Amino acid sequence: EIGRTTDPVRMYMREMGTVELLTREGEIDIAKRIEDGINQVQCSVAEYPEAITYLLEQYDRVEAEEARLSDLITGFVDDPELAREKFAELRAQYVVTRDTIKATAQEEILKLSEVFKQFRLVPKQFDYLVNSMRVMMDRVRTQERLIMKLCVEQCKMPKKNFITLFTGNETSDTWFNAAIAMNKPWSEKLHDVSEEVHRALQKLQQIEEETGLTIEQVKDINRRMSIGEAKARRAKKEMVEANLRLVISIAKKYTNRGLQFLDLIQEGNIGLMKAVDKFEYRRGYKFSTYATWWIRQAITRSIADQARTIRIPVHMIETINKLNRISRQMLQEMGREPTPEELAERMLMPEDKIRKVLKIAKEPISMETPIGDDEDSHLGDFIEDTTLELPLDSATTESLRAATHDVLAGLTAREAKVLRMRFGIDMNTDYTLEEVGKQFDVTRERIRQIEAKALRKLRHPSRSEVLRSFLD
Looking at residues 14 to 33 of the shown chain, list those that interact with other proteins (rule: CB under 8 A).
Answer: 15-16
For the CB of residue 71, give the shortest distance to other proteins in the complex, in Å.
22
Looking at residues 208 to 267 of the shown chain, list those that interact with other proteins (rule: CB under 8 A).
Answer: 233, 236-237, 240-241, 244, 258, 260, 262-263, 266-267
Distance (Å, whole) CA 11 – CA 360: 38
Beta-carbon contacts of residue 354 (< 8 Å; ≥ 6 apart):
323, 340, 343, 344, 347
For the CB of residue 340, give the shortest distance to other proteins in the complex, in Å.
8
Which positions from 305 to 344 touch other proteins by CB under 8 A, shown as an x/- string?
-x--xxxx--------------------------x-x---
For the CB of residue 360, give the shortest distance to other proteins in the complex, in Å.
7
Distance (Å, whole) CA 97 – CA 131: 25
For other proteins, the binding residue among 69, 227, 360, 442 (CB under 8 A) is 360
Looking at residues 43 to 72 of the shown chain, list those that interact with other proteins (rule: CB under 8 A).
Answer: none
State the chain's maximal CA–CA distance in angstroms. Answer: 115
For the CB of residue 293, give the shortest distance to other proteins in the complex, in Å.
19
378 phi and psi angles, rounded to 5 deg: -115, 175
Counting beta carbons within 10 angstroms of the beta carbon of residue 311, is it exposed (0 to 12), middle (13 to 18) or buried (19 or more)? exposed
Closest CA to 90 of 53, 61, 43, 38: 53
Looking at residues 338 to 357 of the shown chain, list those that interact with other proteins (rule: CB under 8 A).
Answer: 339, 341
Stretch that binds other proteins, among 88-96, 126-134, 215-223, 385-393 (CB under 8 A): 385-393
The answer to whether 387 contacts other proteins (rule: CB under 8 A) is yes
Distance (Å, whole) CA 402 – CA 259: 60
For the CB of residue 309, give the shortest distance to other proteins in the complex, in Å.
6
For the CB of residue 385, give the shortest distance to other proteins in the complex, in Å.
8
370 phi and psi angles, rounded to 5 deg: -65, 135
Distance (Å, whole) CA 6 – CA 24: 36
The answer to whether 81 contacts other proteins (rule: CB under 8 A) is no
Counting beta carbons within 10 angstroms of the beta carbon of residue 61, is it exposed (0 to 12), middle (13 to 18) or buried (19 or more)? middle
For the CB of residue 301, give the shortest distance to other proteins in the complex, in Å.
13
Stretch that binds other proteins, among 26-34, 71-79, 144-152, 302-310 (CB under 8 A): 302-310
Integer angstrom CA distances of residue 429 from 107, 403, 423, 426: 80, 21, 9, 10
User: Which one, 442 or 466, has the nearer CB to other proteins?
Assistant: 466
For the CB of residue 260, give the shortest distance to other proteins in the complex, in Å.
8
User: Which one, 110 or 330, has the nearer CB to other proteins?
Assistant: 330
Stretch that binds other proteins, among 36-44, 164-172, 195-203, 400-408 (CB under 8 A): 400-408
Task: Please state whether 312 falls in left (phi above 0), alpha (psi between -120 and 50) or beta.
Answer: beta
Beta-carbon contacts of residue 242 (< 8 Å; ≥ 6 apart):
19, 20, 21, 22, 26
At 192 the three-state DSSP class reads: coil
User: Which one, 124 or 405, has the nearer CB to other proteins?
Assistant: 405
Residue 465 annotated as binding?
A: yes
Q: What is the DSSP string of 222-264?
A: HHHHHHHHHHHHHHHHHHHTTTHHHHHHHTTTT-SSSS-HHHH
For other proteins, the binding residue among 69, 92, 165, 400 (CB under 8 A) is 400
For the CB of residue 355, give the shortest distance to other proteins in the complex, in Å.
8
Q: Binding-site residue total for other proteins (CB under 8 A)?
A: 72
To 5 degrees, how large is the angle CA 51–CA 54–CA 58?
130
Q: In this structure, are residues 140 and 215 in contact, taking their beta carbons and an 8 Å threshold?
A: yes
Looking at residues 406 to 465 of the shown chain, list those that interact with other proteins (rule: CB under 8 A).
Answer: 419, 423-425, 428-430, 455, 458-459, 464
Looking at residues 91 to 150 of the shown chain, list those that interact with other proteins (rule: CB under 8 A).
Answer: none
User: Which one, 167 or 324, has the nearer CB to other proteins?
Assistant: 324
Distance (Å, whole) CA 117 – CA 241: 32
User: Which one, 253 or 311, has the nearer CB to other proteins?
Assistant: 311
For the CB of residue 427, give the shortest distance to other proteins in the complex, in Å.
8
At 281 the three-state DSSP class reads: helix
Distance (Å, whole) CA 170 – CA 466: 95
For other proteins, the binding residue among 202, 380, 406, 453 (CB under 8 A) is 380
The answer to whether 385 contacts other proteins (rule: CB under 8 A) is yes
The answer to whether 374 contacts other proteins (rule: CB under 8 A) is no
User: Which one, 90 or 264, has the nearer CB to other proteins?
Assistant: 264
The answer to whether 395 contacts other proteins (rule: CB under 8 A) is yes
User: Which one, 75 or 424, has the nearer CB to other proteins?
Assistant: 424
User: Which one, 75 or 258, has the nearer CB to other proteins?
Assistant: 258
Binding site feature residues for Mg(2+): 465, 468
Binding site feature residues: 465, 468
